[PDB]
Amino acid sequence: QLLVVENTVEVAQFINNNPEFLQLAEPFWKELSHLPSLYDYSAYRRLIDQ
Amino acid sequence: IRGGRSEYGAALAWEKGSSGLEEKTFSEWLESVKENPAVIDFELAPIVDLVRNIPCAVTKRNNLRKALQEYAAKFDPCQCAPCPNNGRPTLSGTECLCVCQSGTYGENCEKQSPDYKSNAVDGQWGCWSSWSTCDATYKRSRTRECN
Amino acid sequence: GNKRRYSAWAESVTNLPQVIKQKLTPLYELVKEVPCASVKKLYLKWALEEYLDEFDPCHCRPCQNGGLATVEGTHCLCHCKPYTFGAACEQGVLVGNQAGGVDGGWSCWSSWSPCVQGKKTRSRECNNPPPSGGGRSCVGETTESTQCE
Amino acid sequence: SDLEVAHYKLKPRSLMLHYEFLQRVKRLPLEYSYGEYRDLFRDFGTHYI
Amino acid sequence: SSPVNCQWDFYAPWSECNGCTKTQTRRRSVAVYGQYGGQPCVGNAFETQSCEPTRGCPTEEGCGERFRCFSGQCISKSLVCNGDSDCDEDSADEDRCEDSERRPSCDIDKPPPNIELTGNGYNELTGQFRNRVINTKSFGGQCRKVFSGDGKDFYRLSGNVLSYTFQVKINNDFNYE
Amino acid sequence: CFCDHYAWTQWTSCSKTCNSGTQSRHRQIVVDKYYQENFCEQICSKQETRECNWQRCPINCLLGDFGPWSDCDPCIEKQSKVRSVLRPSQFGGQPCTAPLVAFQPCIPSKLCKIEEADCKNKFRCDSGRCIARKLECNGENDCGDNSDERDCGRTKAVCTRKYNPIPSVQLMGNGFHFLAGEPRGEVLDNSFTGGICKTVKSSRTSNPYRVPANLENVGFEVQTA
Amino acid sequence: QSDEANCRRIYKKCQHEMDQYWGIGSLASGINLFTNSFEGPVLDHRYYA
Amino acid sequence: PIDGKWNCWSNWSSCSGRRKTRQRQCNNPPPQNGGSPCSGPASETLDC
Amino acid sequence: PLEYNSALYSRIFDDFGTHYFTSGSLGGVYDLLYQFSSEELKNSGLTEE
Numbered sequence: 001q002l003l004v005v006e007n008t009v010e011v012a013q014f015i016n017n018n019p020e021f022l023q024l025a026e027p028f029w030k031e032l033s034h035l036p037s038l039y040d041y042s043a044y045r046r047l048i049d050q
Numbered sequence: 051i052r053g054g055r056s057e058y059g060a061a062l063a064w065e066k067g068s069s070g071l072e073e074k075t076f077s078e079w080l081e082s083v084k085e086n087p088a089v090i091d092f093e094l095a096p097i098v099d100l101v102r103n104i105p106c107a108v109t110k111r112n113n114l115r116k117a118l119q120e121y122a123a124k125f126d127p128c129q130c131a132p133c134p135n136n137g138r139p140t141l142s143g144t145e146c147l148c149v150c151q152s153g154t155y156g157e158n159c160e161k162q163s164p165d166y167k168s169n170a171v172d173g174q175w176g177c178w179s180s181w182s183t184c185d186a187t188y189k190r191s192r193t194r195e196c197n
Numbered sequence: 198g199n200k201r202r203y204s205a206w207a208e209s210v211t212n213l214p215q216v217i218k219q220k221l222t223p224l225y226e227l228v229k230e231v232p233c234a235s236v237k238k239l240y241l242k243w244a245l246e247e248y249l250d251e252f253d254p255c256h257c258r259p260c261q262n263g264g265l266a267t268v269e270g271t272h273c274l275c276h277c278k279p280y281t282f283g284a285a286c287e288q289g290v291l292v293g294n295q296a297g298g299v300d301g302g303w304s305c306w307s308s309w310s311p312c313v314q315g316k317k318t319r320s321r322e323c324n325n326p327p328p329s330g331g332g333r334s335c336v337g338e339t340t341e342s343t344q345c346e
Numbered sequence: 347s348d349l350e351v352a353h354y355k356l357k358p359r360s361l362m363l364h365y366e367f368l369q370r371v372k373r374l375p376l377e378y379s380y381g382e383y384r385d386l387f388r389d390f391g392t393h394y395i
Numbered sequence: 396s397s398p399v400n401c402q403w404d405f406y407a408p409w410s411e412c413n414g415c416t417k418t419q420t421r422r423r424s425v426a427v428y429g430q431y432g433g434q435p436c437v438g439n440a441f442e443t444q445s446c447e448p449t450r451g452c453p454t455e456e457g458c459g460e461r462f463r464c465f466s467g468q469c470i471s472k473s474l475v476c477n478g479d480s481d482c483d484e485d486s487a488d489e490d491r492c493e494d495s496e497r498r499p500s501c502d503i504d505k506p507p508p509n510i511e512l513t514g515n516g517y518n519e520l521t522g523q524f525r526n527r528v529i530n531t532k533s534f535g536g537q538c539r540k541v542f543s544g545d546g547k548d549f550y551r552l553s554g555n556v557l558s559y560t561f562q563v564k565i566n567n568d569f570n571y572e
Numbered sequence: 573c574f575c576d577h578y579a580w581t582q583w584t585s586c587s588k589t590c591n592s593g594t595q596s597r598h599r600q601i602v603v604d605k606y607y608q609e610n611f612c613e614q615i616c617s618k619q620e621t622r623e624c625n626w627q628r629c630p631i632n633c634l635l636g637d638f639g640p641w642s643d644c645d646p647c648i649e650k651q652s653k654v655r656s657v658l659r660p661s662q663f664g665g666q667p668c669t670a671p672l673v674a675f676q677p678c679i680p681s682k683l684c685k686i687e688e689a690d691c692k693n694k695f696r697c698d699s700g701r702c703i704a705r706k707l708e709c710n711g712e713n714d715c716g717d718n719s720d721e722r723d724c725g726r727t728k729a730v731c732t733r734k735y736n737p738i739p740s741v742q743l744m745g746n747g748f749h750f751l752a753g754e755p756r757g758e759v760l761d762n763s764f765t766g767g768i769c770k771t772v773k774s775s776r777t778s779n780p781y782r783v784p785a786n787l788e789n790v791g792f793e794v795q796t797a
Numbered sequence: 798q799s800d801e802a803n804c805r806r807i808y809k810k811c812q813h814e815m816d817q818y819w820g821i822g823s824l825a826s827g828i829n830l831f832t833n834s835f836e837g838p839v840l841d842h843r844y845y846a
Numbered sequence: 847p848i849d850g851k852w853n854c855w856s857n858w859s860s861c862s863g864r865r866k867t868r869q870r871q872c873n874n875p876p877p878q879n880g881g882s883p884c885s886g887p888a889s890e891t892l893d894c
Numbered sequence: 895p896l897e898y899n900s901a902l903y904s905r906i907f908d909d910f911g912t913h914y915f916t917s918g919s920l921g922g923v924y925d926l927l928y929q930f931s932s933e934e935l936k937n938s939g940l941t942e943e
Contacts (some may be wrong), residue, residue, distance in 0.1 A: 001292060003570035006063075006561070008207045010056055010214045010545065014513045015557035015757055019226045023533040023555065023929055025514065026466045026484040027357055028526075030514060031231065033467070034359075035240075037233045037453060040410045042420045042441050044244030048224070048518075050358065050526050051565040053922030055545050063565040065930030066668075074922070075219030084774075084923035086544040087740050088562045090916030092796065097747055097910060100759065105689040106896050117903035118912060119614070125751050131631055131662055139662075139751045143672070143908075144633060146662035149753065152925060156661060160592075160626045163927060168318055169294075209563075211546050216524065221517055223671070227528060232453040235677060252520045257427045258396075259716050268520075271401045271436045272429035284432050285396045293403045296586040296595070297625050330452070331585035333625070337666040354824055355526050356840075364825065384829040391829035391836035399700070433889050465846075473698065485846065493806055499687045504813075538715045540763065555755035557909055558746060574937050610939050645895040645902075652901035673901045686896060740920060747911035756911035789917075797919070 053088030054079045126196075128177035134172060135159045255305035259326045262286045263300065296334030312345035356395065401436035412446035414453075419444040463489060474536055477530050499514030499536030506531070507550040507559055531556070573612030575599070579618070590629035596621035632659035633668035644678035647686060651678045693722060710767045731769040735782035738762075738772075738790060745786060760786045817843075850875040850884035861894035 003040070015024060024032075036043050058079040065072055093109035100116060101111045129174045133148035135158035140147055150159035153166045162169070176197045181190040223245060228238035255267030255272035256290035264275035264286035304325045309317035319342075323335040365370075367390055370383055409525040412419045422441050429435050458469035464482035474481040476492040478500040514529035535554025542549050545561045552559050578599040587593030594728035598619045612730040638659055646752055653674045661667050680716040691702035707714045709724035721727070745760030766785025774792040783790060801807065825837035851873035859865035867889040875881050895902055 001570070001572040003293075003312050003565075003568070006055055006569045007212055007217065007566045008060055009217065009565075010211050010561065010563055012508070012560045012562040012564070013755065014510070014559045015909070016513065016550045017402075018905060019222070019229065019553045021555045022227065023517075023530040024227065024229065024468075025530050026464070026482070028227075028528050028549055029357075029468060030359060030466055032231045032234075033455075034236050034290060035231075036413045036415070036448070037236055037240075037481060038413060039243060039246060040420050041233065041242050041244060041422060042410075044241055044442050045248065046246060047241070047476045051922070051924055052562070053920075054563055056211045057208040058206050059563050059565045059749065061200065061204045062924065063567045065926075066569070067926045068930070070926075071924075079924070080922065084794075085547075086561065086563065087743075087920030088922055089743055090919045090921045090923070092748070092915040094748060094913035095685055095916045096913055097907075100914065103691075107684065111895055113898045114903055114906060117900055118907065120900055121904050121907050122751065124656055127751060129657070130662055132431055134628060139661055140751065142752050143656060144660060144668040146660045146663075151793060155927070156626070160628065164929075171790060177340055179898070184925075193939060214509050214512075216512050216515075219517060221519060224516060224528070250559075255453065258430055266430070271425050272433065273431075284398075291463075296585070298585055322495060331587075331589070332588040336630050336664065338630075343670075344638060352818075356824075361843045362815050362841045362846075364841045366837060367827075367839040387829065389837050390839050391827040391834065393830040393834075394825055394827045411641065437890065438892055466599060466677060486810065489810055492807075494812075500718075538713050538718060539716070544740050558755070560740075560746070560755070562740065573935075575935065609941070610937055615935075642899055642901075645897050645899055647897075648895045648899075648902065652899055654901055673904075677903075682897070693928045743920065744915055744918070746914075747908070748912045748913045748915060749911035759914050761912050795919075795921075797921075 051077070053086060055082035055086055058082040075179045126177045128175060132172070132174065133159060135162060135166075135169075138174070219270055250306075252307060255303055255321075256326065258304055260286045260298070262291060263295065296331070296333070298330035299326050299328060300332040301328030301335035303335050303337065306341075309343075315343060316344045318342045318343055355394075396431045397428040398433035399427065401425060402427040403565070406442070408497050408511040409444065411450070413449040414448040417446050417448045419446045453498070475538055476538075477514045479534050481533060481535060481536070483533070500536060501534070501540070501551055503540060503549055503551050505548070505550055507541075507543070507552070508546070510553075510556075573607075573614075573616050574612040575612065575616040577606065578602070578612070578616060583639035585620075585751065586624040588625060590625050590627060592626045593624050594621050601621045628663050630663045630665040631659065631661060632657040632665035633667055635670060635672075638674065639792050641676060644680045646682035647684040649678050649680045650675045698722075704767075707767050710765070712765060714764065716761075730767060731782075735769070735771050738781045738783065741784060741787070759795075760787050847879050848873060848875055848877040849855035849881035852884050855890070861889075863891050864894045865889060865891040 031047060051063045062075045062079040065075060098111055098115045099112060101107060125141055125143055127139045127141040127146060130141055132144035133139050135154045136153065137148035137150050140149060148158045152161045155161060174197045178192040179195045181192045184190050200284065217265050225238050225241040225245065228234055228241055242264055252268045254266045254268055257267060260275035262268050262278060262281045264277040265274055275286050279292050281289045301323050302325045304322045306321055307319045309319050320340045328334050370386060371388060403454050404426040406423050407421050409419040409421045410569045413419045416492045420441055420443050425436055455467060461469035462472045463469055468482065470481050475488045477488060478497045480486040481488050499523040506526045510531045514527050516528040517523040518525055525539035533554055533555060534551060537554040539554060540549050541552055545563060578601050580599055581597040583595040583597050583789060584597050596619055636655045638653045638655045641653045644651045657670060671678055682765060693705055694702035695708045696702045697703050698719040699715060703714055707718050708720045710720060711730045713726040714720050741762045744754045745758060745762035747757055747759035751754045762784040764785050771780035771782050772790055821842050823835065825838055825840040825842040826835050828835055850870045853869050853872040856867040870884045875883050
């Protein structure tokens with residue numbers, strides 16, 4: 001039996017800002033714009049899927 | 051391996067270890083460490099010293115100092131259970147992670163190397179009590195039990 | 198693998214690195230800058246829990262031999278430990294070393310108690326499978342409680 | 347060997363159609379007449395990625 | 396073990412009606428998960444109905460004094476006509492802009508080698524990275540250079556990323572038996 | 573003895589789920605001519621035992637109730653509600669999973685008392701930072717948005733050359749989270765040159781590295797530590 | 798080019814040298830799912846807006 | 847080994863459980879040390 | 895905010911940490927462990943009658 005397990009890390013960290021200062025991607029934002037503003041789970045499930 | 055450049059760090063990490071250091075490899079890695087060092091040690095100062103030359107700088111500084119005292123009291127790692135093998139706990143607010151002494155490994159430092167001595171040597175701070183009621187001289191106090 | 202093969206790979210991952218460690222924030226925290234943003238944010242919170250309900254492998258009866266069940270659409274699969282093939286991982290044998298037994302597994306949450314005093318409550322039962330043969334206990338709390346809406 | 351070299355995603359909305367597909371859709375009869383929609387599929391398939 | 400074929404639940408009661416589309420919906424949950432190779436439940440999990448809406452469709456707010464990207468995202472006018480695409484998919488802030496009026500926003504344009512992966516969403520159950528949620532390349536008109544040290548190159552970070560650093564770690568484990 | 577002839581029983585179930593139980597197994601010994609002659613009684617191990625479940629038992633996270641909503645800040649106009657961890661998870665217990673802080677849009681009672689800082693004479697960058705007036709038109713970007721260079725005549729040729737940045741110098745300017753022992757967001761801009769060219773050369777062959785103004789000293793001596 | 802004819806001044810937005818994504822045009826063509834066959838073009842992956 | 851092949855699924859049955867059927871007829875697996883039977887669903891049923 | 899709010903201010907420690915380096919040392923760390931094990935049994939029995 002042999003096991004090898006290995007990692008290399010090249011970006012020690014990235015830290016994204018908190019949600020106040022994050023800029024949304026235009027497509028994701030444009031999708032949020034069309035969310036039905038009511039609990040129609042069919043839409044939100046599409047968002048969570050994508 | 052920590053610090054260096056990916057090629058030479060990788061190459062050095064891949065040495066079987068039957069031999070110890072391959073001087074070519076180690077020396078190249080050290081050169082890359084000169085090219086891309088990693089933090090080894092440091093002397094901290096509190097971040098509240100830095101808030102300066104801003105609108106309401108003093109109000110925000112004193113609010114931040116109060117918030118720091120509350121935040122530390124809220125997230126002091128003495129609410130962690132103790133790490134084994136003299137591992138030291140650290141708290142990411144919701145989870146405690148153990149940092150391992152050299153000569154112990156596994157995810158929470160659970161298994162010793164063959165050389166490891168003095169097993170179950172222990173000792174680390176508990177956190178402070180809440181403050182006492184004010185004494186005769188109107189001083190409060192708190193204590194931590196080394197427990 | 199050859200030392201040169203591995204070193205060339207480890208260099209090339211400098212230019213095409215993947216994400217390999219992460220800390221996560223719920224997606225609803227990003228609902229922003231839109232009409233009714235605050236309402237949609239709440240509804241997306243409620244959507245995420247419903248999604249997890251739809252997908253928690255608690256819905257899957259156990260695999261043998263430590264196979265991991267997971268939800269794939271409307272049916273489960275077993276992700277078998279190496280060389281332990283078949284529909285439930287019933288075939289073949291495990292390589293390496295194991296503690297054996299049957300590791301216990303959580304059954305799905307009950308529906309919440311209805312907001313008594315403004316508080317919800319729910320429970321789980323660790324019977325899928327029950328821990329057996331010295332297999333380890335299921336890991337986690339049996340019950341939860343929370344504020345209402 | 348399974349090797350993966352990129353991930354692709356198409357936008358979900360307001361897609362720009364190809365001229366040939368655009369024309370071929372325009373010419374579709376409003377009445378249901380299977381053979382023309384079949385020819386559409388034969389020319390361009392049934393699905394997009 | 397026996398295959399078990401999936402079974403649906405009954406249909407749920409309808410959603411409230413969408414004031415924009417005027418459509419209701421109802422889902423049909425799985426009553427029994429198919430298992431051990433049993434058949435998945437066939438058909439769609441949902442159906443739709445037309446309605447008469449009780450609620451109005453909320454309108455967009457404008458950008459006001461802010462610049463309006465063609466999608467309708469808004470940005471500070473200081474980013475307009477700037478030499479950076481501060482609208483991300485649209486680049487309307489850089490439309491109709493004289494290159495003699497532009498100034499070089501930064502020495503460089505090259506972001507870190509895969510920073511876009513830091514902007515993907517993530518699915519915790521499946522564990523797979525999903526599509527682009529955050530714009531990782533809004534430079535905000537800053538010239539935020541970092542020297543990678545590793546990789547021996549300069550990269551331009553976005554204006555808002557809290558940190559991005561290139562110290563390296565390696566881990567190797569062998570088990571011969 | 574060829575001790576494999578007296579094959580092992582399978583490992584006894586792990587003595588405990590966690591905190592290092594042990595599992596063990598005897599051989600299928602049969603006392604026989606082969607057992608007597610080949611020193612098999614002497615040198616075959618009758619049983620073996622090993623450690624198992626060495627990882628420490630998991631600890632699950634626990635949380636308290638949310639407190640009251642805070643009195644609304646008139647400038648942020650969000651009211652904040654918080655709760656505290658009663659014990660952390662560790663050793664692979666259930667994560668706390670729920671957010672520790674909630675925000676709600678209020679309608680505030682008070683007005684904001686904020687005002688902009690005029691910083692007297694200092695050059696106000698468009699970001700609203702003020703920097704020493706001499707850094708206007710300095711020939712380099714010190715406002716970060718180049719607004720000190722927004723429009724200039726005879727900019728000073730501050731430095732003769734594009735001197736190199738110090739290795740990883742920004743790591744010196746990241747903040748640190750002492751309760752977690754890990755770096756966090758960037759706090760000091762160790763790109764800021766102060767408008768001076770002061771420089772340190774690591775070796776006679778090395779190019780001079782430009783020292784950023786946040787650093788009082790750098791040394792390049794190699795130590796083993 | 799009917800968008801670029803008669804223009805008094807052209808505002809070249811990308812001064813830079815740009816490649817297309819490799820094989821990106823193939824993904825713009827629809828598939829017959831049943832046959833897994835790529836067919837005629839359905840989406841225009843040379844439109845950049 | 848002859849592996850199974852499905853015939854075409856039968857036409858849609860009437861409402862009260864709209865339904866189709868399949869028979870593995872198109873190539874019955876058993877011949878020549880037959881291969882695997884065909885996958886299901888040997889019959890399939892749906893809303894009207 | 896100018897008024898005190900423990901949450902909003904605590905996000906400063908979450909994002910940027912509690913402290914900063916006044917001084918320190920940068921370099922690298924090498925750690926290795928190797929653990930070989932080997933065993934050999936031989937048997938050579940002869941019996942004759």
